[PDB]
C-alpha cells in the first residue's frame, strides 16, 4: 500500500528512529523501490537510503552503484526512476565524502577490468599480466579501501576505521575462460590474507544470484535459531556477490576450490581409463535426442553401465587422515542436501558440475551461477526431469551409504525447519515478487512459483514421505536418462 500519505505518516515517525542495521537485508528490493517523484513515502524511502548509505557505506554502496551503474534514458521503466533516486542518494552520501567517492572509483575500476578479456591459460606459482593496471597495484596507497569481497561485519555505530584495506595486488590472472568472459584477480590483505575476485563480463544473472544469496543468508539465520537445524551446523553455504552490473558484475572467487564439472573429468580418466570417455557419452546421447522413450532409457543404461562412478575418490587421498575426511564428507552431504532441498523449493535452474564448487579442507558445497530459478529449466527447449542435482557420481561421493542416512536426515530436518519458519520465508519471497529484479523464468510466473513453494512445504504429506519421494524422483534412472547429455 503506497497510495495514501496518512498511512505513511505514522510509519515515517517510527522508521526514522530505526537503526540502519535493520534495513540492509532487504535493501536490494528497497533500493529497487525508490523513485525521483516527490511523495511522503518517497521522502521516507530517501531518508532510509541516506541513513544506510551514510552510516554503513560498505553494505549499501555496492547495491547503490548496482542500481545506478547502467541505466538508459530513452526506454521508460521504473529502473530509470530508481536510478535517478539512487544517484541523488549517492550525491547526498558523497556531500557528507572521501570513502563514498573511493568506493565509487573502486567500482568503476572493477567494472572496467571486467569489461576486457584476453585469451590464455595459467596456473601454479607466479604469473604477470594486465594492461593499464596502475590503479590496482596502489589501491590503498591512493584510496585506503577494502577489496570489495569480504564479509565486513556490521557494526551498530556504523563508522569503523578498523576494516582491513589492501593495496598490493598480485600480478597473476589465472584466468580460465568459460562461456563469455571470466577474469580472476587476486589481491593481498591488510591482515596478510589474499582475496580472489572472479569478475565476469558475460551476462550471468548476478543480481538474481545476489538476491538468491540474500535468501540463502536468511535461511542460514533460520537454521541458526533452532535446535536440530543447528546442532548439525547445517547451512546452505553462501558466496558473497557484489554485482556492479548484471552483465559485468564481480563475485568472490571462493577460497581454494575445484569445481565439480572441471573435476572428475581428470578423475574419470585417471581412475577409469579403460571405460568410455565423455565424448562417447555426449553425442551418443546426442543420437538419443530424437529417439523414443525406451531407446533413450536403453542407451542411457548402456552408457551408465560403461562409466562407473568416480567422484567417490575425491574425498579419499586428498584431505587428511580419516577424521578430517569424514568431517568433510558429512559437511558435503549436509551442504548439498540443504542446497538441493532449497533449490527444489525455489526451483533453482542449472545444476551441472560447472555450477558446483566443492570447498576442500572443509567440504561444504557452494552452488554457483543460480541464474535460472523458480522452476525455470525444466521448461527449457530441451526438457528435464530431475528437480535437484543428483547424479550417480554425486551420490557416490556422499560415501558408501547412498542418499539414505545423513543426506536424508539433513534433508528432512531442513524441510521441517523450512516449514516451521514458512511464514517468514514466503514473506521474503513475496518481497522478491513485488520487485522487478528477481528472474521468474502484471501476472507473472512468480505467483504460481511461490504457490508451488507453499505446496512443496505443505503439511498435507509427512515430511519423511516428502523426502523419500524427492530422493526417489532424483535417483531413479528413468528420470535421469531424459535429463541431458552426460549427467551419469
Amino acid at each position: 500500500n503506497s497510495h495514501l500519505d496518512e498511512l505513511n505518516n505514522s510509519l515515517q515517525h517510527y522508521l526514522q528512529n530505526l537503526p540502519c542495521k535493520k534495513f540492509i537485508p532487504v535493501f536490494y528490493q528497497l533500493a529497487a523501490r525508490l523513485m525521483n517523484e516527490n511523495s511522503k513515502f518517497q521522502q521516507s524511502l530517501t531518508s532510509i537510503c541516506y541513513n544506510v548509505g551514510r552510516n554503513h557505506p560498505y553494505h549499501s554502496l555496492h547495491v547503490l552503484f548496482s542500481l545506478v551503474s547502467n541505466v538508459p534514458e530513452i526506454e521508460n521503466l521504473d529502473a530509470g526512476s530508481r536510478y535517478r533516486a539512487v544517484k541523488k542518494i549517492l550525491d547526498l552520501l558523497k556531500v557528507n565524502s572521501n570513502l563514498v567517492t573511493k568506493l565509487l572509483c573502486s567500482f568503476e575500476n572493477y567494472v572496467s577490468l571486467a569489461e576486457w578479456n584476453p585469451r590464455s591459460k595459467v596456473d601454479s606459482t607466479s604469473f604477470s599480466r594486465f594492461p593499464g593496471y596502475k590503479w590496482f597495484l596502489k589501491d590503498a596507497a591512493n584510496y585506503g579501501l577494502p577489496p570489495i569481497t569480504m564479509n565486513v561485519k556490521v557494526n551498530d555505530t556504523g563508522d569503523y576505521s578498523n576494516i582491513p584495506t589492501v593495496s598490493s595486488f598480485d600480478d597473476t590472472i589465472h584466468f580460465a575462460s568459460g562461456i563469455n568472459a571470466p577474469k580472476v584477480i587476486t589481491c593481498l590483505g591488510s591482515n596478510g590474507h589474499t582475496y580472489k575476485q572472479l569478475v565476469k563480463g558475460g551476462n550471468d544473472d548476478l543480481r538474481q544470484d545476489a538476491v538468491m544469496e540474500q535468501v540463502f543468508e536468511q535461511v542460514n539465520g533460520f537454521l541458526r535459531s533452532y535446535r536440530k537445524t543447528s546442532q548439525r551446523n547445517l547451512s546452505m553455504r553462501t558466496y558473497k556477490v557484489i554485482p556492479l552490473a548484471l552483465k559485468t558484475g564481480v563475485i568472490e572467487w571462493v577460497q581454494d576450490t575445484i569445481p565439480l564439472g572441471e573435476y572428475l573429468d581428470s578423475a574419470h580418466k585417471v581412475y577409469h581409463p579403460k571405460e568410455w570417455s565423455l565424448s562417447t557419452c555426449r553425442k551418443l546421447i546426442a543420437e538419443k535426442q530424437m529417439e523414443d522413450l525406451e531407446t533413450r532409457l536403453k542407451v542411457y543404461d548402456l552408457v551408465c553401465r560403461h562409466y562407473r562412478p568416480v567422484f567417490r575418490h575425491f574425498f579419499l587421498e586428498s584431505y587428511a587422515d580419516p577424521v578430517q575426511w569424514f568431517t568433510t564428507q558429512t559437511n558435503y552431504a549436509r551442504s548439498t542436501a540443504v542446497a538441493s532441498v532449497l533449490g527444489h523449493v525455489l526451483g533453482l535452474g542449472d545444476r551441472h558440475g560447472q555450477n558446483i564448487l566443492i570447498d576442500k579442507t572443509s567440504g561444504e558445497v557452494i552452488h554457483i551461477d543460480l541464474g535460472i530459478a523458480f522452476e525455470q529449466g525444466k521448461k527449457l527447449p530441451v526438457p528435464e526431469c530431475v528437480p535437484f542435482r543428483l547424479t550417480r557420481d554425486v551420490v557416490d561421493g556422499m560415501g558408501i551409504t547412498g542418499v539414505e542416512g545423513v543426506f536424508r536426515r539433513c534433508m528432512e530436518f531442513t524441510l521441517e525447519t523450512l516449514r516451521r519458519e514458512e511464514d517468514s520465508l514466503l514473506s521474503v519471497l513475496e518481497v522478491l515478487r513485488y520487485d522487478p529484479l528477481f528472474s521468474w523464468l502484471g501476472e507473472s510466473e512468480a505467483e504460481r512459483a511461490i504457490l508451488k513453494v507453499r505446496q512443496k512445504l505443505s503439511s498435507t504429506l509427512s515430511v519423511e514421505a516428502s523426502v523419500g519421494e524427492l530422493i526417489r524422483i532424483a535417483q531413479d534412472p528413468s528420470y535421469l536418462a531424459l535429463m541431458f547429455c552426460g549427467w551419469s
Binding site: 560447472q354 525455470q376 529449466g377 527449457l380
Partner: peptide, 8 residues
C-alpha cells in the same frame, strides 16, 4: 563445455 545454453 556442453551444458544447455539456458537461452531465452
Amino acid at each position: 563445455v556442453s551444458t544447455q545454453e539456458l537461452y531465452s
